[PDB]
Symmetry: C4
Subunit: 327 residues, 4 copies
């Protein structure tokens, strides 16, 4: 070493989905919901497996309320005080499932996590996000959380390789968050030169996780519905959206609108603005209501299935044949 | 699966046509007309095989009138009332061959289609356009239209693979419309991640269709005459132009001028304006087309001369005295970028 | 078939020149002149083998006068009247070698060509430019011009393949003009979809021509000195510049100034080449770059450049 | 001839670093310092191996003062008069190690170089920069400097191939400056068509140098910390920054301000503004006549440094290298499409 990996890793861009013979009625005959039985928490899931990322500007209760109307999952950002949770939980009883409480490895975070899980029981999911998901320190933090909440479904990331995927599933995690570099506000590649193309990561990781009867989440990398579809077809059980959800009303950030061409604030989770307030800080153009964007995404996914012959999202990858595009 | 296909599919951009020794006089000695004998309708065709797409903004009678002056085909959009057809057919007797009536799988559409074919018996061509040309529901619908009009030449699409090409040809269609994703106002790839590079599609499909003694239409993907040339050389029997024809006088769209620059709208068969402007029944017609803007091009008149002109040169350059020989003489060179 | 060619043809952009160990003093110890003995006209050449393209806006006498100060060749555009030639020839006796009279296959053209060659015997070069250099109508015409002027060095193009290169050399031409598509004001690819990457063309054609003891000219495709260097290293005997020379004082076109900057029309497509001022500097800039290329590769003479060339493939750059 | 090289050379852009399981605490548990024992000068080094390029606008004493606070090396541009050196050396006693005196092959240059090395013996590094580092001439100049200062660590460049790397190491140089073309103000490729992708160059050259127990410097090509990281992982012992350091306060160039934004001129070593500003003798200093450009004013280098070192620290955490030495040893490059 250093040695170069012969096989070229490809991204969503380098690929397309080949249409296939089917018997599907209309795009409406498509069921975008899925039933999962998590390996470790032994719990069950049901709903459209698209998650709003646990970023300050995206994982907001205001956001969760809408995604809930469509059965979409939400990983609430790790900032809301125990009070807002109880408040939200109060005004939105039903939308408590399909919601995850986030947390880092930090003691403060873990203590703020317990507090919330103890207070609101309707929340059976935990979202663990460390800097380097390949850190032994993380593997242990994961186990610990496993023991302390043996019946909560655990989402832990991020990684981009099958190996660390298995390690984490065995050390206790239920869903592994796949993705390093391809994020919108994410800039690992510029600042560290470390990364891994989403598509190749998802395919490789999804495979690993599935062998252990576990699941993965395609975290970051999507800019359009097609990518989300590509992600699902690649094997992702859940697709987590960050930037694609930023810039809406229900979204976070300051509506610092420029010459008609309005721009809302969008800081990463470890950004310069997140640090100073509690990663790049960018201006996502105001997109209005998430309401439509969700209909637009689910809409696209529905078509993808029709085109491929999958009556239900579960059949999507099973019927997926990726074609390689020049550019 | 999933499985990634090893072979990289390439587009018009990834390729060029290699010049070849010939004995051609001048670009004028080139005949861009073709004679076809359709497999199922058993009918015959003759004219330049370039079709104006059946999009609201392109497949207009106003457009058809001009293309007619040059022998180009027109797939009239699925909106004109039986009256306008009647009118058009009236004022332009001759231009009724080389004209196709379009339709979706919807009952309303099919009833409106019959009405037109019964009324104007010069329109011998039908253009069937479904969302997913891979659905059995389409194969089915095609079968029906075949029976109901056993002697009309049927154009049905779209697909991008030889298999579904054969399926449709056997199911009764005469010409298969090839193309998914590459369209201008088309955005299948962005919204669904589904697509297929035009060049590879055309080559693969053209081959399939030809084996069953059928034909194909390269639908969408062309932005310049060279692409149309590339398409023909790739084996396409007909090349259908959409965006390349949008933005003209005879074209449709709103003259939404901007910054001392005259533009024109471009959406098509499945967009928000298609849904808005149509009584309903277009949602599953094509992805949901993007309503893009196209700078005002003036008269199609020129553009046509510009296209036919380019195709003529392509043939001169390759040694094809007639379009029929273009692909026969085509050798594609791969470009790095 | 129709078949796709497996081997990917690459352009100047897809490649670079690998530095090499040498004993060269300074960039000044580099000789950019070359001696050629043309296969058919049996004539001889000597000077820097870079030619100003025979385009209306580039192959001007005004341009030729300057390039002459540096030993560069000029293919005069086929428009100047027999009078201007006689005048130019008059005021610039010496600059008559390293000058070519251009012409198409058209009878009118050939007539005007004769008149000029007859009137000015100090011009020993003809530049034949047809639309499709692959047409038999051209091979023939070439054969004719050969007979009618058995001792003039003939430049004929364009083509992009070794085959047609040989055909033309045997048909009588001395230098084959290589290039279809890559031109600046050239837009063959957009309108016809026909073309061929310069680098691959030059390499392939240069090889062909050289086997028959003939020569080629890399016509079009260069945008910077490095490209010209790349072309020479690729095997081109002469490099013909069109756009890179447009937009100067001595250049043609109309100085259509806009929004604060000065531009000029370049003529296919009609494009605006921002006014660059005097060709004078551009020439020194080009020769300069070629000189460095040789130093870095170890070629003391332009003749050794390709001999010492190893192209590295680049992802981009 | 000529022939095209089959193997495609790739740049920093065509690649990424694959994360790896590790036992690292936090990004803080990473040591970015390295100990080197130079092959010829037999001297020793210790500090963070990132060097500020010896360009007029970057290798300034003002710059050196700050980089010194972080243990970064500085190749002082070859213009400062013997007086300024004296002064700098005076007011900043400690910051003399980790500083190199630059010079071209020109007599004037060498004459000036001696004068500085004699006056300030605390300066134990020499930076030799010729136009074409492949000229047998340079090789000789190198051998001469070796003899005249048998105990100074010599940095000589630039080249991009293992062969010339060995030649130079054997002729006497300690560190070989790798890089031709990829520079910011560098424009070798546009004017000469000559170049070589940084990544491939560094890997190939680093290997060569290391076999002879020598070292290399990745010169130019970096635009972000990730590139610097990529360079180190690729095998570079030192990474020299030019453009990434231009446009700061401590930087050189003219502090222009236009359209409400403040900038700084960033001219090359052989640029036109260099030849016109310099006394003479810089025309063959670097492989091409550099372009003068406007780098947007970046403020204090102070921060940029913390930002770079910061990024490198993360790269190591991600890969499992506790010490910068282990970075390449643990590096696996994933080839990327885009
Ligand atoms: N490395 C890094 N990743 C971030 C940061 N902020 C957000 N992310 C990642 O970006 C993901 C969303 O990606 P997106 O949908 O915007 O392409 C989040 O789920 C998270 O994993 C950050 O500041 N640094
Ligand atoms: N998926 C999709 N395709 C469309 C839509 N409108 C037009 N198209 C396709 O785009 C083709 C024209 O492509 P173009 O010549 O603009 O590149 C039309 O012939 C039709 O096949 C649409 O709304 N959705
Ligand atoms: N060829 C050439 N290289 C230069 C010139 N000026 C600076 N350089 C190179 O640019 C390198 C720094 O590259 P950067 O950090 O801007 O990408 C310097 O170390 C030096 O080797 C110049 O004028 N010509």
């Amino acid at each position: 070493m250093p040695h170069i990996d012969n096989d070229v890793k490809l991204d969503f861009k380098d690929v397309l989905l080949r249409p296939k013979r089917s018997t599907l009625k209309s795009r409406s005959e498509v069921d975008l919901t899925r039933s999962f039985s998590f390996r470790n928490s032994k719990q069950t899931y049901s709903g459209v497996p698209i998650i709003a990322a646990n970023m300050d500007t995206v994982g907001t209760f205001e956001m969760a309320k809408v995604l809930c109307k469509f059965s979409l999952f939400t990983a609430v950002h790790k900032h809301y005080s125990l009070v807002q949770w109880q408040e939200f939980a109060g005004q939105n009883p039903d939308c408590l499932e399909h919601l995850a409480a986030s947390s880092g490895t930090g003691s403060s975070d873990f203590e703020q996590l317990e507090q919330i899980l103890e207070a609101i029981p309707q929340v059976k999911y935990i979202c663990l996000d460390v800097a380097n998901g390949y850190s032994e320190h993380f593997v242990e933090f994961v186990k610990d959380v496993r023991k302390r909440f043996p019946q909560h479904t655990i989402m832990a990331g991020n990684v981009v390789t099958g190996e660390m995927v298995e390690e984490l599933i065995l050390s206790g995690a239920d869903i592994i968050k796949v993705g390093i570099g391809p994020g919108s506000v994410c800039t690992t590649r510029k600042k560290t030169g470390v990364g891994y193309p989403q598509l190749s990561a998802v395919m490789e990781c999804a495979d690993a996780a599935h062998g252990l009867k576990g699941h993965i989440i395609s975290d970051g990398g999507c800019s359009c519905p097609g990518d989300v579809a590509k992600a699902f077809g690649a094997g992702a059980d859940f697709v987590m959206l960050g930037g694609m959800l930023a810039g809406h009303s229900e979204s976070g950030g300051e509506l610092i609108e420029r010459d008609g061409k309005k721009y809302k604030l969008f800081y990463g989770m470890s950004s310069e603005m997140a640090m100073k307030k509690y990663g790049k800080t960018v201006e996502v153009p105001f997109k209005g209501d998430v309401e439509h964007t969700i209909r637009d995404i689910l809409g696209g996914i529905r078509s993808t299935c029709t085109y491929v012959g999958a009556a239900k999202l579960k059949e999507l990858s099973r019927r997926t044949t990726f074609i390689r595009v020049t550019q």
